[PDB]
């Protein structure tokens, strides 16, 4: 059950375990019951090195979960500036919208992450 | 037991963000309800499962919106977030009974 283990380690922040799992063939596209990939969870949590490992091993930077959120959405909601910058550098879509039209900029603005909102505005 | 300690650290890292941002989630809006599911309810479920597993604790946390009788969707989110923290307290109590 490597996919579930990877989703768990990526949320908790177990860097060593994520690296072990990828080296042993874990699916970088593993999906939890909410449509999250590991990259969703690591980006939401602010786990920078895990985000880097997942992107290096093929994670879709622009994956949508079942509620229409991308990793960029979740990092912009949670307030992790360095995650947002890394995602943007890897081609994250600033114009990705959830099911009611909310962009990552919208979440950053509504949740008071002003530095991220400014970075997203300039990127747009 | 090291894995359990790491789970607590991940939970508390998540909790610090969720406790501040939940007060801004309008649970009655489409995006707010979805964000509560994606970023609060789903990670909470995963942490709680990871906490319970080393101790044989099999419980499924479910939100109880009937216990949050507010028109204001921000107050619903805060009230549901409190149910999340209360479930943490309940699992910790079960774990302490097993350990002792």
Numbering used by the authors:
A (entry chain A): 15 to 138
B (entry chain B): 205 to 304
List sentences quoted exactly from the publication behind this structure.
The bacterial human pathogen Helicobacter pylori produces a type IV secretion system (cagT4SS) to inject the oncoprotein CagA into gastric cells. While the composition of the pilus is unclear, CagI is present at the surface of the bacterium and required for pilus formation. Using Alpha Fold 2 and Small Angle X-ray scattering, it was found that CagI forms elongated dimers mediated by rod-shape N-terminal domains (CagIN) prolonged by globular C-terminal domains (CagIC). Three Designed Ankyrin Repeat Proteins (DARPins) K2, K5 and K8 selected against CagI interacted with CagIC with subnanomolar affinities.
The two complex structures revealed that each asymmetric unit contained one DARPin molecule and a fragment of CagI that had undergone proteolysis during crystallisation. The K5 and K2 interaction site of CagI consists of a hydrophobic groove formed by α4 and α5 residues. Interactions between DARPins and CagI are widespread along the groove and extend to the concave face formed by the DARPin variable loops that wrap around α5. Interestingly, sequences of DARPin K2 and K5 differed only by a single amino-acid at position 125, being a leucine for K5 and a phenylalanine for K2 suggesting that the binding modes of the two DARPins were similar but with a 10-fold increase in affinity for K2 compared to K5. A single residue difference between K2 and K5 in the C-cap moiety of the DARPin generates small but significant changes in the DARPin/CagI interface. In K2, the phenylalanine 125 inserts deeper into the pocket and is stabilised by a T-shaped pi-stacking with the nearby Y91. In addition, the side chain of CagI residue K225 makes two hydrogen bonds with the carbonyl of the F125 main chain and the N127 side chain of DARPin K2. As a consequence, the surface buried by complex formation is slightly increased in CagI:K2 with 994 Å2 compared to 974 Å2 in CagI:K5. Crystals of CagI:K5 and CagI:K2 diffracted to resolutions of 2.0 Å and 1.8 Å, respectively and belonged to the orthorhombic space group P212121 with very similar cell dimensions. DARPin K2 efficiently inhibits AGS cell binding to full-length CagI or CagIC in a dose-dependent manner but had no effect on AGS cell binding to CagL.
